[PDB]
Amino acid sequence: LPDLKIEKLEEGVFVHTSFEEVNGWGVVTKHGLVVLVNTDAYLIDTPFTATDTEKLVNWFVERGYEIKGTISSHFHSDSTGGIEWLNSQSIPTYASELTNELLKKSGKVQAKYSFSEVSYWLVKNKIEVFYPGPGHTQDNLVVWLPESKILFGGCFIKPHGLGNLGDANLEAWPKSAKILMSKYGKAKLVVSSHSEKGDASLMKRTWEQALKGLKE
Ligand SMILES: C[C@@H](O)[C@@H](C(=O)O)[C@H]1NC(C(=O)O)=C(S[C@@H]2CN[C@H](CNS(N)(=O)=O)C2)[C@@H]1C
Ligand SMILES: [Zn+2]
Ligand SMILES: [Zn+2]
8 A cells, every 4th residue: 555665774774665465465564775875875675566666766866866786685576576677777686696596487587687605795894795594585685784783684584473484494494593693693773574673682583483483
Protein backbone atom coordinates (compact mmCIF):
# COMPACT_ATOMS: atom_id res chain seq x y z
CA LEU A 1 0.00 0.00 0.00
CA PRO A 2 2.04 3.15 1.08
CA ASP A 3 4.85 4.72 -1.03
CA LEU A 4 8.50 4.09 -0.09
CA LYS A 5 9.42 5.83 3.22
CA ILE A 6 12.83 7.55 3.80
CA GLU A 7 14.06 8.20 7.39
CA LYS A 8 17.41 9.72 8.50
CA LEU A 9 19.39 7.52 11.00
CA GLU A 10 22.22 10.03 11.40
CA GLU A 11 24.47 12.33 9.31
CA GLY A 12 24.72 10.66 5.84
CA VAL A 13 22.74 7.43 6.64
CA PHE A 14 19.06 6.94 5.68
CA VAL A 15 16.75 3.94 5.95
CA HIS A 16 14.45 3.34 2.98
CA THR A 17 11.41 1.18 3.73
CA SER A 18 9.23 -0.37 1.00
CA PHE A 19 6.12 -2.57 1.21
CA GLU A 20 5.03 -5.37 -1.16
CA GLU A 21 2.27 -8.02 -0.93
CA VAL A 22 4.10 -11.32 -1.76
CA ASN A 23 1.90 -14.47 -2.26
CA GLY A 24 1.22 -15.99 1.24
CA TRP A 25 3.46 -13.75 3.41
CA GLY A 26 1.00 -10.81 3.16
CA VAL A 27 2.55 -7.30 3.04
CA VAL A 28 6.35 -7.54 3.56
CA THR A 29 8.14 -4.51 5.10
CA LYS A 30 11.71 -4.25 3.62
CA HIS A 31 14.44 -1.90 4.97
CA GLY A 32 17.50 -0.81 2.94
CA LEU A 33 19.96 2.08 3.47
CA VAL A 34 21.12 5.14 1.52
CA VAL A 35 24.68 6.16 2.44
CA LEU A 36 26.08 9.62 1.49
CA VAL A 37 29.79 10.10 0.71
CA ASN A 38 30.15 13.90 0.14
CA THR A 39 27.52 14.64 -2.63
CA ASP A 40 27.47 10.94 -3.81
CA ALA A 41 24.64 8.54 -2.70
CA TYR A 42 24.83 4.71 -2.51
CA LEU A 43 21.75 2.43 -2.32
CA ILE A 44 22.21 -0.54 0.08
CA ASP A 45 19.60 -2.94 -1.44
CA THR A 46 16.93 -1.75 -3.94
CA PRO A 47 13.27 -1.53 -2.92
CA PHE A 48 10.89 -4.22 -4.31
CA THR A 49 9.73 -2.28 -7.44
CA ALA A 50 10.98 -0.02 -10.30
CA THR A 51 8.39 2.52 -8.99
CA ASP A 52 9.78 2.66 -5.40
CA THR A 53 13.41 2.63 -6.71
CA GLU A 54 12.58 5.63 -9.00
CA LYS A 55 10.91 7.49 -6.03
CA LEU A 56 14.03 6.74 -3.89
CA VAL A 57 16.57 7.87 -6.56
CA ASN A 58 14.48 10.99 -7.45
CA TRP A 59 14.28 12.00 -3.72
CA PHE A 60 18.13 12.11 -3.42
CA VAL A 61 18.62 13.57 -6.97
CA GLU A 62 16.18 16.47 -6.17
CA ARG A 63 18.15 17.07 -2.88
CA GLY A 64 21.38 17.49 -4.96
CA TYR A 65 22.98 13.99 -4.75
CA GLU A 66 24.39 11.85 -7.60
CA ILE A 67 23.48 8.13 -7.27
CA LYS A 68 27.00 6.60 -7.68
CA GLY A 69 26.13 2.92 -7.05
CA THR A 70 23.79 0.28 -5.62
CA ILE A 71 24.75 -3.02 -3.88
CA SER A 72 22.26 -5.92 -3.54
CA SER A 73 22.83 -8.01 -0.34
CA HIS A 74 21.38 -11.14 -2.11
CA PHE A 75 19.52 -12.36 -5.22
CA HIS A 76 15.88 -12.26 -3.89
CA SER A 77 13.45 -9.53 -5.15
CA ASP A 78 13.38 -7.55 -1.81
CA SER A 79 17.15 -6.71 -2.49
CA THR A 80 17.27 -6.64 -6.35
CA GLY A 81 13.75 -5.56 -7.56
CA GLY A 82 15.08 -2.15 -8.70
CA ILE A 83 18.13 -3.45 -10.66
CA GLU A 84 16.45 -3.48 -14.14
CA TRP A 85 15.24 0.15 -13.73
CA LEU A 86 18.64 1.37 -12.33
CA ASN A 87 20.44 -0.32 -15.31
CA SER A 88 18.10 1.50 -17.79
CA GLN A 89 19.13 4.83 -16.09
CA SER A 90 22.91 3.93 -16.26
CA ILE A 91 23.15 3.95 -12.42
CA PRO A 92 25.89 1.39 -11.64
CA THR A 93 24.43 -1.77 -9.97
CA TYR A 94 26.70 -4.17 -8.00
CA ALA A 95 26.21 -7.76 -6.79
CA SER A 96 28.58 -10.68 -5.93
CA GLU A 97 29.43 -13.03 -8.86
CA LEU A 98 27.40 -15.71 -7.04
CA THR A 99 24.38 -13.33 -6.65
CA ASN A 100 24.54 -12.41 -10.37
CA GLU A 101 24.62 -16.14 -11.35
CA LEU A 102 21.67 -16.88 -9.02
CA LEU A 103 19.74 -13.96 -10.67
CA LYS A 104 20.62 -15.38 -14.17
CA LYS A 105 19.52 -18.93 -13.10
CA SER A 106 16.21 -17.38 -11.75
CA GLY A 107 15.64 -15.59 -15.13
CA LYS A 108 16.07 -12.11 -13.53
CA VAL A 109 18.12 -9.10 -14.74
CA GLN A 110 21.71 -9.01 -13.36
CA ALA A 111 23.64 -6.16 -11.72
CA LYS A 112 26.02 -4.55 -14.31
CA TYR A 113 29.14 -5.06 -12.05
CA SER A 114 30.13 -8.11 -9.92
CA PHE A 115 32.95 -8.90 -7.38
CA SER A 116 34.14 -12.16 -5.68
CA GLU A 117 36.05 -10.75 -2.61
CA VAL A 118 34.88 -11.91 0.90
CA SER A 119 35.75 -8.41 2.34
CA TYR A 120 35.88 -5.50 -0.08
CA TRP A 121 35.46 -1.75 0.02
CA LEU A 122 32.56 -0.56 -2.22
CA VAL A 123 33.83 2.90 -1.03
CA LYS A 124 37.28 2.91 0.72
CA ASN A 125 37.00 3.56 4.54
CA LYS A 126 33.21 4.27 4.13
CA ILE A 127 31.28 1.15 2.86
CA GLU A 128 32.60 -2.43 3.39
CA VAL A 129 30.78 -5.49 1.84
CA PHE A 130 31.30 -8.77 3.80
CA TYR A 131 30.29 -12.41 3.13
CA PRO A 132 29.80 -14.13 6.55
CA GLY A 133 28.80 -17.43 4.85
CA PRO A 134 25.45 -18.99 3.83
CA GLY A 135 22.28 -18.49 5.93
CA HIS A 136 19.07 -16.96 4.56
CA THR A 137 20.67 -17.74 1.15
CA GLN A 138 23.99 -19.14 -0.20
CA ASP A 139 24.96 -15.59 -1.36
CA ASN A 140 23.77 -13.33 1.54
CA LEU A 141 26.10 -10.29 2.23
CA VAL A 142 26.22 -7.64 4.98
CA VAL A 143 27.34 -4.01 4.66
CA TRP A 144 29.47 -2.29 7.34
CA LEU A 145 29.75 1.53 7.73
CA PRO A 146 33.00 2.02 9.72
CA GLU A 147 32.45 5.76 10.49
CA SER A 148 28.92 5.29 11.99
CA LYS A 149 29.59 1.68 13.24
CA ILE A 150 26.26 0.68 11.57
CA LEU A 151 25.86 -2.88 10.21
CA PHE A 152 23.24 -3.58 7.48
CA GLY A 153 22.51 -7.33 7.93
CA GLY A 154 19.82 -7.66 5.21
CA CYS A 155 17.74 -10.90 5.32
CA PHE A 156 20.59 -12.71 7.20
CA ILE A 157 19.71 -10.93 10.53
CA LYS A 158 16.58 -12.72 11.86
CA PRO A 159 16.05 -12.17 15.61
CA HIS A 160 12.34 -13.28 15.63
CA GLY A 161 11.73 -16.11 13.03
CA LEU A 162 13.88 -16.96 9.97
CA GLY A 163 11.17 -16.13 7.36
CA ASN A 164 11.49 -17.62 3.82
CA LEU A 165 13.53 -20.89 4.16
CA GLY A 166 13.05 -21.83 0.44
CA ASP A 167 16.72 -20.99 -0.44
CA ALA A 168 18.18 -21.12 3.13
CA ASN A 169 21.26 -23.12 4.29
CA LEU A 170 20.22 -24.00 7.87
CA GLU A 171 23.33 -26.24 8.34
CA ALA A 172 25.65 -23.22 7.57
CA TRP A 173 23.60 -20.38 9.14
CA PRO A 174 24.76 -20.86 12.80
CA LYS A 175 28.46 -20.97 11.64
CA SER A 176 27.90 -17.87 9.41
CA ALA A 177 26.18 -16.06 12.38
CA LYS A 178 29.20 -16.81 14.63
CA ILE A 179 31.59 -15.48 11.93
CA LEU A 180 29.46 -12.26 11.75
CA MET A 181 29.40 -11.88 15.60
CA SER A 182 33.23 -12.33 15.69
CA LYS A 183 33.81 -9.67 12.97
CA TYR A 184 31.26 -6.96 13.97
CA GLY A 185 30.90 -7.15 17.83
CA LYS A 186 31.75 -3.34 17.66
CA ALA A 187 28.47 -2.54 15.71
CA LYS A 188 26.53 0.09 17.73
CA LEU A 189 23.46 -0.49 15.47
CA VAL A 190 22.26 -3.48 13.38
CA VAL A 191 19.73 -2.68 10.60
CA SER A 192 18.01 -5.79 9.19
CA SER A 193 15.66 -6.27 6.19
CA HIS A 194 12.46 -7.02 8.20
CA SER A 195 13.11 -6.44 11.94
CA GLU A 196 13.38 -3.31 14.15
CA LYS A 197 16.92 -1.88 14.29
CA GLY A 198 18.77 -2.83 17.52
CA ASP A 199 22.19 -3.35 19.14
CA ALA A 200 24.94 -5.97 18.40
CA SER A 201 22.88 -8.60 20.35
CA LEU A 202 20.68 -9.03 17.18
CA MET A 203 23.65 -11.06 15.80
CA LYS A 204 23.45 -13.38 18.88
CA ARG A 205 19.60 -13.58 18.53
CA THR A 206 20.13 -14.59 14.83
CA TRP A 207 22.65 -17.30 15.91
CA GLU A 208 19.99 -18.65 18.37
CA GLN A 209 17.14 -18.52 15.77
CA ALA A 210 19.36 -20.28 13.17
CA LEU A 211 20.12 -23.15 15.64
CA LYS A 212 16.40 -23.36 16.64
CA GLY A 213 15.35 -23.48 12.93
CA LEU A 214 18.03 -26.11 12.12
CA LYS A 215 16.74 -28.29 15.04
CA GLU A 216 13.54 -28.77 12.83
C1 LIG B 1 10.27 -10.79 0.16
C2 LIG B 1 11.08 -11.73 -0.69
O1 LIG B 1 11.97 -10.99 -1.53
C3 LIG B 1 11.88 -12.75 0.13
C4 LIG B 1 13.26 -12.23 0.40
O2 LIG B 1 13.97 -12.27 -0.64
O3 LIG B 1 13.66 -11.87 1.48
C5 LIG B 1 11.34 -13.28 1.50
N1 LIG B 1 12.48 -13.28 2.38
C6 LIG B 1 12.12 -13.12 3.64
C7 LIG B 1 13.18 -13.02 4.63
O4 LIG B 1 13.61 -11.94 4.93
O5 LIG B 1 13.70 -14.14 5.05
C8 LIG B 1 10.76 -12.92 3.78
S1 LIG B 1 9.67 -13.14 5.14
C9 LIG B 1 9.95 -11.78 6.32
C10 LIG B 1 10.60 -12.38 7.58
N2 LIG B 1 9.90 -11.72 8.68
C11 LIG B 1 9.09 -10.61 8.18
C12 LIG B 1 7.93 -10.29 9.15
N3 LIG B 1 7.55 -8.87 9.04
S2 LIG B 1 6.81 -8.22 7.74
N4 LIG B 1 5.65 -7.25 8.29
O6 LIG B 1 6.16 -9.28 7.04
O7 LIG B 1 7.75 -7.39 7.06
C13 LIG B 1 8.65 -11.16 6.82
C14 LIG B 1 10.25 -12.63 2.38
C15 LIG B 1 8.85 -13.16 2.15
ZN1 LIG C 1 15.69 -13.46 0.54
ZN1 LIG D 1 13.72 -10.62 2.90
